[PDB]
CSV table of C-alpha atoms in Angstrom, one decimal:
chain,number,residue,atom,x,y,z
A,1,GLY,CA,125.2,22.7,106.1
A,2,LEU,CA,124.9,19.9,104.0
A,3,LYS,CA,122.1,16.9,104.7
A,4,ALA,CA,123.4,13.1,104.8
A,5,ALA,CA,122.0,12.5,101.5
A,6,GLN,CA,123.4,15.3,99.7
A,7,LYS,CA,126.8,13.8,100.6
A,8,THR,CA,126.6,9.9,99.4
A,9,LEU,CA,127.6,10.8,95.9
A,10,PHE,CA,131.0,12.7,97.0
A,11,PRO,CA,133.6,12.3,95.8
A,12,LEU,CA,132.7,13.5,92.1
A,13,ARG,CA,135.9,11.9,90.1
A,14,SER,CA,134.3,13.1,86.4
A,15,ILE,CA,131.7,14.7,84.4
A,16,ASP,CA,129.0,12.1,84.8
A,17,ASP,CA,129.3,11.9,88.5
A,18,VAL,CA,128.8,16.1,88.6
A,19,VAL,CA,125.8,15.4,86.3
A,20,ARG,CA,124.5,12.9,89.0
A,21,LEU,CA,124.9,15.3,91.9
A,22,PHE,CA,122.6,17.8,89.7
A,23,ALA,CA,120.3,15.3,88.7
A,24,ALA,CA,119.8,14.0,92.6
A,25,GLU,CA,119.7,17.8,93.7
A,26,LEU,CA,116.8,18.5,90.9
A,27,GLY,CA,114.7,15.3,92.3
A,28,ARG,CA,114.7,17.5,95.6
A,29,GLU,CA,112.2,19.5,97.2
A,30,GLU,CA,114.8,22.2,96.5
A,31,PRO,CA,118.1,21.8,94.6
A,32,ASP,CA,120.6,23.4,97.1
A,33,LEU,CA,122.0,26.4,94.8
A,34,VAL,CA,125.3,27.0,97.3
A,35,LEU,CA,126.3,23.3,97.0
A,36,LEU,CA,125.9,23.1,93.0
A,37,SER,CA,127.6,27.0,92.4
A,38,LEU,CA,130.7,25.5,94.5
A,39,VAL,CA,130.8,22.2,92.7
A,40,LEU,CA,130.6,24.3,89.5
A,41,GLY,CA,133.2,27.5,90.3
A,42,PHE,CA,135.5,24.2,91.6
A,43,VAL,CA,135.6,22.0,88.7
A,44,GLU,CA,135.6,25.3,86.2
A,45,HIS,CA,138.6,27.4,88.4
A,46,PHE,CA,141.0,23.2,87.6
A,47,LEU,CA,139.8,22.8,84.1
A,48,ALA,CA,139.7,26.5,83.0
A,49,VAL,CA,141.8,28.9,85.6
A,50,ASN,CA,144.2,27.2,86.6
A,51,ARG,CA,144.8,23.3,84.3
A,52,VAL,CA,148.1,22.6,86.3
A,53,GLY,CA,148.5,18.8,87.5
A,54,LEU,CA,145.4,18.2,85.8
A,55,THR,CA,145.5,14.2,84.4
A,56,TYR,CA,142.0,13.8,84.1
A,57,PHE,CA,138.9,15.5,86.2
A,58,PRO,CA,139.3,17.8,89.2
A,59,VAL,CA,137.9,15.8,92.0
A,60,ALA,CA,135.7,17.0,93.8
A,61,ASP,CA,136.6,15.8,97.8
A,62,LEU,CA,133.6,15.9,100.2
A,63,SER,CA,135.8,17.2,102.8
A,64,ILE,CA,137.0,20.6,100.3
A,65,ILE,CA,133.5,21.5,99.2
A,66,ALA,CA,131.7,21.1,102.8
A,67,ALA,CA,134.5,23.2,103.8
A,68,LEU,CA,134.0,25.8,101.0
A,69,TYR,CA,130.2,25.2,102.0
A,70,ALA,CA,130.5,26.0,105.4
A,71,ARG,CA,132.7,29.1,104.8
A,72,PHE,CA,129.6,30.5,103.0
A,73,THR,CA,127.1,29.5,105.0
A,74,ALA,CA,129.2,30.8,108.4
A,75,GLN,CA,129.6,34.1,106.5
A,76,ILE,CA,125.8,34.9,105.9
A,77,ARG,CA,124.6,33.6,109.0
A,78,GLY,CA,127.2,35.7,110.9
A,79,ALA,CA,126.3,38.9,109.0
A,80,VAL,CA,122.3,38.4,108.7
A,81,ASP,CA,120.6,38.2,111.7
A,82,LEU,CA,117.1,37.4,110.8
A,83,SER,CA,115.7,38.2,114.2
A,84,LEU,CA,115.5,41.6,113.2
A,85,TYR,CA,114.0,41.0,110.5
A,86,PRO,CA,110.5,39.1,111.4
A,87,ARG,CA,109.2,37.2,108.0
A,88,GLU,CA,105.3,39.0,108.4
A,89,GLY,CA,103.5,36.1,106.6
A,90,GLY,CA,105.9,33.8,105.8
A,91,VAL,CA,107.8,36.4,103.4
A,92,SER,CA,110.9,38.2,103.4
A,93,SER,CA,110.9,41.9,103.4
A,94,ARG,CA,112.3,44.5,101.5
A,95,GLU,CA,115.0,45.3,104.5
A,96,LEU,CA,116.1,41.9,104.5
A,97,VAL,CA,116.6,41.4,101.0
A,98,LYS,CA,118.1,45.1,100.8
A,99,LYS,CA,120.8,43.6,104.3
A,100,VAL,CA,121.6,40.3,102.0
A,101,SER,CA,122.4,42.4,98.9
A,102,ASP,CA,125.2,44.6,101.6
A,103,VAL,CA,126.8,41.6,102.9
A,104,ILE,CA,127.2,40.0,99.3
A,105,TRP,CA,128.6,43.7,98.1
A,106,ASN,CA,130.4,44.8,100.9
A,107,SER,CA,132.4,41.4,100.4
A,108,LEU,CA,134.1,42.0,97.5
A,109,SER,CA,137.6,43.5,96.5
A,110,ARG,CA,137.8,46.9,96.3
A,111,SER,CA,139.6,47.1,93.3
A,112,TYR,CA,138.9,44.6,90.5
A,113,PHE,CA,137.9,43.9,86.7
A,114,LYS,CA,134.2,43.2,86.7
A,115,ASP,CA,134.4,41.9,83.0
A,116,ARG,CA,136.7,38.8,83.7
A,117,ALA,CA,136.2,35.1,83.3
A,118,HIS,CA,135.1,32.8,86.0
A,119,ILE,CA,134.0,35.1,88.6
A,120,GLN,CA,130.5,34.3,88.1
A,121,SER,CA,130.3,31.3,90.7
A,122,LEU,CA,130.1,31.4,94.5
A,123,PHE,CA,133.9,29.6,94.4
A,124,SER,CA,135.2,32.9,92.8
A,125,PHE,CA,133.2,34.8,96.1
A,126,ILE,CA,134.8,32.6,98.1
A,127,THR,CA,138.7,32.3,97.2
A,128,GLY,CA,138.5,35.4,95.3
A,129,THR,CA,135.9,37.6,96.6
A,130,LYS,CA,135.0,38.3,93.2
A,131,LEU,CA,132.1,38.1,91.7
A,132,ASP,CA,130.5,39.6,88.1
A,133,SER,CA,127.3,41.7,88.2
A,134,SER,CA,124.4,38.9,87.8
A,135,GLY,CA,126.7,36.8,90.0
A,136,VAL,CA,126.1,39.2,92.5
A,137,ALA,CA,122.8,38.3,92.1
A,138,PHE,CA,122.7,35.1,91.9
A,139,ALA,CA,124.6,34.8,95.2
A,140,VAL,CA,122.2,37.3,96.7
A,141,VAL,CA,119.5,34.3,96.1
A,142,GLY,CA,121.9,31.4,97.3
A,143,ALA,CA,122.3,33.1,100.1
A,144,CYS,CA,118.7,33.5,100.7
A,145,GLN,CA,118.2,30.0,99.9
A,146,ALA,CA,120.6,29.5,102.8
A,147,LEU,CA,118.5,31.7,105.3
A,148,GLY,CA,115.4,29.8,104.5
A,149,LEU,CA,113.9,32.7,102.2
A,150,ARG,CA,111.7,30.3,99.9
A,151,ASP,CA,109.8,33.5,98.6
A,152,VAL,CA,114.0,34.8,96.9
A,153,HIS,CA,113.8,34.1,93.5
A,154,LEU,CA,116.1,35.5,90.4
A,155,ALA,CA,114.7,37.8,87.4
A,156,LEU,CA,117.0,37.9,84.4
A,157,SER,CA,116.5,40.1,81.4
A,158,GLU,CA,118.5,40.1,78.3
A,159,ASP,CA,121.0,42.2,80.3
A,160,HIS,CA,120.7,42.2,83.9
A,161,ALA,CA,119.5,40.5,87.2
A,162,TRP,CA,118.0,41.4,89.9
A,163,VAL,CA,115.2,39.8,92.7
A,164,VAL,CA,111.8,38.9,93.1
A,165,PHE,CA,110.2,38.0,96.7
A,166,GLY,CA,107.5,39.0,98.6
A,167,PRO,CA,103.7,38.7,99.1
A,168,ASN,CA,102.8,36.2,96.5
A,169,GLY,CA,106.3,36.9,94.6
A,170,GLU,CA,104.9,40.4,93.5
A,171,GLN,CA,107.9,42.5,94.8
A,172,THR,CA,111.3,43.3,92.9
A,173,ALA,CA,114.5,44.5,94.1
A,174,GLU,CA,117.9,45.8,92.4
A,175,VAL,CA,120.4,43.7,94.5
A,176,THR,CA,123.8,44.3,92.0
A,177,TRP,CA,124.8,47.1,90.2
A,178,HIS,CA,124.4,47.4,86.3
A,179,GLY,CA,126.7,48.5,83.6
A,180,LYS,CA,129.5,50.9,84.2
A,181,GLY,CA,128.0,54.5,86.0
A,182,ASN,CA,129.5,54.1,89.7
A,183,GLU,CA,125.9,54.3,91.3
A,184,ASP,CA,123.7,51.6,92.1
A,185,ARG,CA,119.7,51.1,92.9
A,186,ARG,CA,120.0,48.4,94.8
A,187,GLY,CA,117.1,48.3,97.2
A,188,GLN,CA,114.7,49.7,94.8
A,189,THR,CA,112.4,48.2,92.7
A,190,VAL,CA,112.3,47.8,88.6
A,191,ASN,CA,109.3,49.6,88.4
A,192,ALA,CA,110.7,52.9,86.3
A,193,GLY,CA,112.2,50.9,84.0
A,194,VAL,CA,108.8,48.5,83.1
A,195,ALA,CA,107.3,52.0,82.6
A,196,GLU,CA,110.1,53.5,80.4
A,197,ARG,CA,110.1,50.7,78.2
A,198,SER,CA,113.6,50.1,78.2
A,199,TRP,CA,115.0,46.6,76.3
A,200,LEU,CA,116.7,46.7,80.0
A,201,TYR,CA,113.1,45.5,81.6
A,202,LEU,CA,111.4,44.4,78.7
A,203,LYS,CA,108.4,46.0,79.5
A,204,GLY,CA,107.9,44.0,82.2
A,205,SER,CA,108.5,40.0,80.1
A,206,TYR,CA,111.8,39.5,82.1
A,207,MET,CA,112.2,35.6,83.6
A,208,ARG,CA,111.1,35.1,87.2
A,209,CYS,CA,113.1,31.9,88.1
A,210,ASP,CA,112.2,29.0,90.2
A,211,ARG,CA,114.8,26.8,91.5
A,212,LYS,CA,114.7,24.6,89.4
A,213,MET,CA,115.8,27.6,86.4
A,214,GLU,CA,117.8,29.0,89.3
A,215,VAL,CA,120.4,25.4,88.5
A,216,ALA,CA,119.2,26.5,85.2
A,217,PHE,CA,121.0,29.7,85.2
A,218,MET,CA,124.1,28.8,86.9
A,219,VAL,CA,124.5,26.0,84.7
A,220,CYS,CA,124.3,28.6,81.4
A,221,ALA,CA,127.0,30.8,83.3
A,222,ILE,CA,129.6,28.2,83.3
A,223,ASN,CA,132.3,29.8,81.4
A,224,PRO,CA,134.4,27.0,79.1
A,225,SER,CA,137.1,29.3,77.7
A,226,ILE,CA,140.8,29.2,78.8
A,227,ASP,CA,141.8,31.5,76.4
A,228,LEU,CA,140.8,33.6,73.4
A,229,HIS,CA,141.8,30.6,71.5
A,230,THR,CA,141.0,27.8,73.4
A,231,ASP,CA,138.3,26.4,75.2
A,232,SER,CA,137.6,23.3,77.6
A,233,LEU,CA,136.8,20.1,76.5
A,234,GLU,CA,135.1,19.2,79.2
A,235,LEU,CA,133.4,22.3,80.4
A,236,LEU,CA,131.9,22.3,77.3
A,237,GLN,CA,130.6,18.9,78.0
A,238,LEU,CA,129.8,19.5,81.4
A,239,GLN,CA,127.7,22.5,80.3
A,240,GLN,CA,126.3,20.5,77.1
A,241,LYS,CA,124.9,17.3,79.6
A,242,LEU,CA,123.5,19.4,82.1
A,243,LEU,CA,122.0,21.7,79.5
A,244,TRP,CA,119.5,17.9,78.5
A,245,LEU,CA,119.2,17.3,81.9
A,246,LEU,CA,117.3,20.0,82.6
A,247,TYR,CA,115.6,20.7,79.4
A,248,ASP,CA,114.4,16.9,79.5
A,249,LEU,CA,113.0,17.5,83.4
A,250,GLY,CA,110.9,20.6,81.6
A,251,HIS,CA,113.3,23.2,83.0
A,252,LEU,CA,114.4,25.2,79.8
A,253,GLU,CA,110.3,25.5,79.3
A,254,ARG,CA,110.6,29.5,79.6
A,255,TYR,CA,114.8,30.0,79.1
A,256,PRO,CA,115.0,31.4,76.2
A,257,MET,CA,118.7,31.9,76.2
A,258,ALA,CA,119.6,28.8,77.6
A,259,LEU,CA,117.7,27.1,74.7
A,260,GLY,CA,120.2,29.2,72.3
A,261,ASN,CA,123.2,28.2,74.7
A,262,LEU,CA,122.2,24.5,74.1
A,263,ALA,CA,121.7,24.9,70.7
A,264,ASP,CA,125.4,26.9,69.8
A,265,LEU,CA,126.6,23.5,71.7
A,266,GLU,CA,125.3,21.8,69.8
A,267,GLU,CA,126.1,23.1,66.9
A,268,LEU,CA,129.9,22.3,67.8
A,269,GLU,CA,129.7,18.8,68.8
A,270,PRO,CA,126.3,17.4,68.5
A,271,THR,CA,125.1,14.5,70.7
A,272,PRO,CA,123.5,11.4,68.8
A,273,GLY,CA,119.6,11.6,69.0
A,274,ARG,CA,119.0,14.9,69.8
A,275,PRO,CA,117.1,17.8,68.1
A,276,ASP,CA,119.2,19.7,65.6
A,277,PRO,CA,120.4,23.5,66.0
A,278,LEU,CA,118.1,24.8,64.4
A,279,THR,CA,115.0,23.3,65.9
A,280,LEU,CA,116.6,24.5,69.7
A,281,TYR,CA,116.6,27.6,68.5
A,282,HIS,CA,112.7,27.9,67.1
A,283,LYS,CA,112.6,26.2,70.6
A,284,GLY,CA,114.1,29.4,72.3
A,285,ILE,CA,112.0,31.6,69.9
A,286,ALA,CA,108.5,29.7,71.1
A,287,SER,CA,109.8,30.4,74.3
A,288,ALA,CA,109.6,33.7,74.1
A,289,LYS,CA,106.2,34.0,72.0
A,290,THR,CA,104.4,31.8,74.6
A,291,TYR,CA,106.1,33.1,77.8
A,292,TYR,CA,107.2,36.2,77.1
A,293,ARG,CA,104.8,38.2,74.5
A,294,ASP,CA,107.6,37.6,72.0
A,295,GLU,CA,109.3,40.7,73.6
A,296,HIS,CA,112.6,39.0,73.7
A,297,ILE,CA,115.4,39.9,71.2
A,298,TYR,CA,118.1,37.0,71.9
A,299,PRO,CA,116.0,34.2,70.5
A,300,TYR,CA,116.2,35.5,66.6
A,301,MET,CA,119.6,37.3,67.6
A,302,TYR,CA,120.7,33.4,68.2
A,303,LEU,CA,118.8,31.9,65.5
A,304,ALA,CA,120.7,34.8,62.7
A,305,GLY,CA,124.0,34.0,64.1
A,306,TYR,CA,123.9,30.7,63.3
A,307,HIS,CA,122.3,31.3,59.6
A,308,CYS,CA,125.6,33.6,59.4
A,309,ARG,CA,127.9,30.9,60.6
A,310,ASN,CA,126.6,29.0,57.6
A,311,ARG,CA,126.8,32.1,55.0
A,312,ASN,CA,122.8,31.7,54.9
A,313,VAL,CA,122.8,34.9,53.9
A,314,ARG,CA,118.6,34.8,53.2
A,315,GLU,CA,117.8,32.9,56.4
A,316,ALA,CA,120.3,35.4,58.4
A,317,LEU,CA,118.4,38.2,57.2
A,318,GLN,CA,114.9,37.1,57.7
A,319,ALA,CA,116.1,36.2,61.4
A,320,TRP,CA,118.1,39.9,61.9
A,321,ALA,CA,114.4,41.3,59.8
A,322,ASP,CA,112.4,39.6,63.0
A,323,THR,CA,114.8,41.3,65.9
A,324,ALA,CA,114.1,44.5,64.2
A,325,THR,CA,110.5,43.9,64.2
A,326,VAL,CA,110.5,42.8,68.1
A,327,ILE,CA,112.8,45.8,68.9
A,328,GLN,CA,109.9,48.1,67.1
A,329,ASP,CA,108.1,48.4,70.5
A,330,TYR,CA,110.7,49.1,73.3
A,331,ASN,CA,111.8,52.7,73.9
A,332,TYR,CA,115.6,53.0,73.2
A,333,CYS,CA,116.9,54.2,76.8
A,334,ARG,CA,119.6,55.3,79.0
A,335,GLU,CA,121.5,51.3,80.2
A,336,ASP,CA,120.3,50.0,76.4
A,337,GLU,CA,123.9,50.5,75.0
A,338,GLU,CA,124.3,46.9,75.4
A,339,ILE,CA,121.4,46.3,72.2
A,340,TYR,CA,122.6,49.0,70.4
A,341,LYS,CA,125.6,47.9,70.3
A,342,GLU,CA,124.4,44.8,68.8
A,343,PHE,CA,122.1,46.1,66.1
A,344,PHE,CA,125.0,48.7,65.1
A,345,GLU,CA,127.9,45.6,64.1
A,346,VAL,CA,124.9,43.9,62.8
A,347,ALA,CA,124.1,46.7,60.6
A,348,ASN,CA,127.7,48.0,59.9
A,349,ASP,CA,130.0,45.0,60.0
A,350,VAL,CA,128.0,42.0,60.2
A,351,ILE,CA,125.4,42.4,57.4
A,352,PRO,CA,128.2,44.2,54.7
A,353,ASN,CA,130.3,41.5,54.6
A,354,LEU,CA,127.5,39.0,54.2
A,355,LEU,CA,126.8,40.7,51.2
A,356,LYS,CA,130.4,41.0,49.9
A,357,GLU,CA,130.7,38.0,49.9
A,358,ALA,CA,127.2,37.2,48.1
A,359,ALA,CA,128.2,39.8,45.6
A,360,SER,CA,131.6,37.8,44.8
A,361,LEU,CA,129.4,34.7,44.8
A,362,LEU,CA,126.9,36.1,42.7
A,363,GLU,CA,130.2,37.2,40.0
A,364,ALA,CA,130.8,33.7,40.0
A,365,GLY,CA,127.6,32.3,39.0
A,366,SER,CA,126.1,31.3,42.6
A,367,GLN,CA,122.1,30.8,41.2
A,368,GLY,CA,119.6,31.3,43.9
A,369,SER,CA,121.8,34.0,45.8
A,370,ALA,CA,120.0,35.9,48.5
A,371,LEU,CA,121.3,39.3,46.0
A,372,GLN,CA,118.9,37.9,43.6
A,373,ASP,CA,116.1,37.0,45.9
A,374,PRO,CA,113.3,40.0,46.2
A,375,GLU,CA,112.6,38.5,49.8
A,376,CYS,CA,115.9,39.1,51.0
A,377,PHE,CA,115.7,42.9,50.3
A,378,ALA,CA,112.0,43.2,51.6
A,379,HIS,CA,113.9,41.6,55.0
A,380,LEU,CA,116.9,44.4,54.8
A,381,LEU,CA,114.5,46.7,54.6
A,382,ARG,CA,111.9,45.3,57.4
A,383,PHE,CA,115.3,45.1,59.6
A,384,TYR,CA,116.1,49.0,58.9
A,385,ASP,CA,112.4,49.8,59.4
A,386,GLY,CA,112.1,48.2,62.7
A,387,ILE,CA,115.2,50.4,64.0
A,388,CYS,CA,113.7,53.5,62.8
A,389,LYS,CA,110.6,52.7,65.2
A,390,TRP,CA,112.8,51.9,67.6
A,391,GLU,CA,114.1,55.7,67.4
A,392,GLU,CA,110.6,56.8,66.9
A,393,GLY,CA,109.4,58.4,70.5
A,394,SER,CA,112.8,57.3,71.9
A,395,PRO,CA,113.8,59.5,74.6
A,396,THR,CA,117.8,58.7,73.1
A,397,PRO,CA,118.5,59.0,69.1
A,398,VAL,CA,119.6,55.8,67.2
A,399,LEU,CA,120.3,56.3,63.6
A,400,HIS,CA,123.4,58.6,62.2
A,401,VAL,CA,125.5,59.5,59.4
A,402,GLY,CA,127.4,56.2,60.3
A,403,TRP,CA,124.7,54.1,59.9
A,404,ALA,CA,124.1,55.8,56.8
A,405,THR,CA,126.8,54.9,54.7
A,406,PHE,CA,126.6,51.2,55.6
A,407,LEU,CA,123.0,51.7,54.4
A,408,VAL,CA,123.6,52.8,51.1
A,409,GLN,CA,126.5,49.9,50.5
A,410,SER,CA,123.8,47.2,51.3
A,411,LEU,CA,120.7,48.2,49.5
A,412,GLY,CA,123.7,48.7,46.6
A,413,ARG,CA,124.0,45.0,47.0
A,414,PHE,CA,121.0,44.3,45.1
A,415,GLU,CA,120.3,44.4,41.8
A,416,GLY,CA,117.7,47.9,41.1
A,417,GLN,CA,115.6,45.0,38.8
A,418,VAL,CA,115.8,42.8,42.2
A,419,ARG,CA,114.8,45.7,44.1
A,420,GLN,CA,111.8,47.0,42.0
A,421,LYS,CA,110.2,43.4,42.8
A,422,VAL,CA,109.5,44.5,46.6
A,423,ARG,CA,106.0,46.1,47.1
A,424,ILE,CA,106.0,48.8,49.6
A,425,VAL,CA,102.1,49.0,50.8
A,426,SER,CA,100.1,51.2,53.3
A,427,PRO,CA,106.3,40.7,48.0
A,428,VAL,CA,104.9,43.1,49.9
A,429,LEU,CA,106.4,45.0,52.7
A,430,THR,CA,104.4,47.3,55.7
A,431,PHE,CA,106.8,50.1,56.9
A,432,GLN,CA,106.1,51.2,59.9
A,433,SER,CA,108.5,54.1,60.9
A,434,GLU,CA,108.0,57.3,59.4
A,435,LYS,CA,111.5,57.2,57.9
A,436,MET,CA,111.3,54.4,55.9
A,437,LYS,CA,107.4,55.7,54.2
A,438,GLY,CA,110.0,58.7,53.4
A,439,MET,CA,112.6,56.5,51.7
A,440,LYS,CA,110.0,54.4,50.3
A,441,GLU,CA,110.6,55.8,46.7
A,442,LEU,CA,114.7,56.2,47.0
A,443,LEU,CA,114.7,52.4,47.2
A,444,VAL,CA,114.1,51.3,43.7
A,445,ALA,CA,116.1,53.7,41.2
A,446,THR,CA,119.1,51.9,39.4
A,447,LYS,CA,121.3,54.3,40.9
A,448,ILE,CA,120.7,54.5,44.4
A,449,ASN,CA,120.2,58.6,45.1
A,450,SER,CA,122.9,57.9,48.5
A,451,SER,CA,122.7,61.7,49.5
A,452,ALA,CA,119.0,61.8,49.7
A,453,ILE,CA,118.9,58.7,51.2
A,454,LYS,CA,121.6,59.5,53.8
A,455,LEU,CA,119.5,63.0,54.7
A,456,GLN,CA,116.3,60.8,55.5
A,457,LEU,CA,117.8,58.5,57.6
A,458,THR,CA,119.2,61.2,59.8
A,459,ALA,CA,116.7,63.1,59.4
A,460,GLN,CA,119.1,65.8,58.3
A,461,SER,CA,117.3,69.0,56.9
A,462,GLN,CA,120.5,70.6,54.8
A,463,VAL,CA,122.8,69.7,53.0
A,464,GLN,CA,126.1,72.0,53.2
A,465,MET,CA,126.9,75.7,52.1
A,466,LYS,CA,129.3,75.6,49.8
A,467,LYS,CA,129.6,73.7,46.6
């Protein structure tokens, strides 16, 4: 269904040929999402799923790509009769969006693991009848473009995908599942989730893609992983070059996660002349502040991760405190479990390991240690304060005694003479949470009162009956 101009670069014989195709499509009125996703899925299949026979690059012949494209357009156009859904005022209806969602969803294999790698693209949809959750949302948007539905666009939070459409692009519709429960809300708006103030819907500060950002999404969706221990260098290079192409064209401006992904790729293999990973992480944060009311968690997570890998305890703690400062204005809701998992791992695994190594290095005479810096102690306190404030008023609790043991351990990594230098005001630190306000006196004792800290963090009111 391809136009003559779209076919002239074939066959694609290299990474750079694929980049040329993306550049050409991004210069058109709209880039062809179906074509681009099929090309990426094809090359990812032969670079990560099955490398048998690979000698340089899996050549993408026009005949092969056109035949996959024809399979997709035949399925969609055969199943969705537009005459049954008149486009009132040139915009799509909720029934039409639901129909496209049903067509994709009903095509999927009846039994398969949704967490598998390499089931994100239209190549997977056509050849394997398998898609992951956000892959279904992308496929619905690609199908809508194939049908001429210019108003249907991908919407993305930090943990979920759906579509926007209709008059002024103001309607939302679920088109895929979220997480592991049986029931979906396909066809419904996201308004209840926005109103709930869950992290899942970002209080409404989610991404609303244009077609160029949908290209950025499929590029971020490339998965270079061959196995647990090995990535495809070819796919890493492809994803990195495509992200720079998008960056230069302005299409990552409103896409914090893509900037974090690009920073991570630059850390692995820097491109000469380009901004450093730190600069890119900060651009991601600036994007979230500018376009999303500073209501995204991952821009700070990406930054903290980089600092953590470099064993920069001070800056990792600062960035995690900043994540907690964002989460504190959310309600912890059912379906937000991924972000709970992430905070749990930072508080109860990653921070303890960092501080354990810091303590060993301090014993060996390190200077300027985070453990001797009252500002670092304040970051740790601010991290816990945001988590406690997140919990306030939430329908689901967050803290339990399993968190309290690591809090006591982490507090103890800082000597009392360091801890005493932080002034808690009603370094200077202000607590937002009632749990941390009640904790304030306990925070400066030479020997931390473990039992009292545990009671205060868990809001347990009693100790054991018997001696």
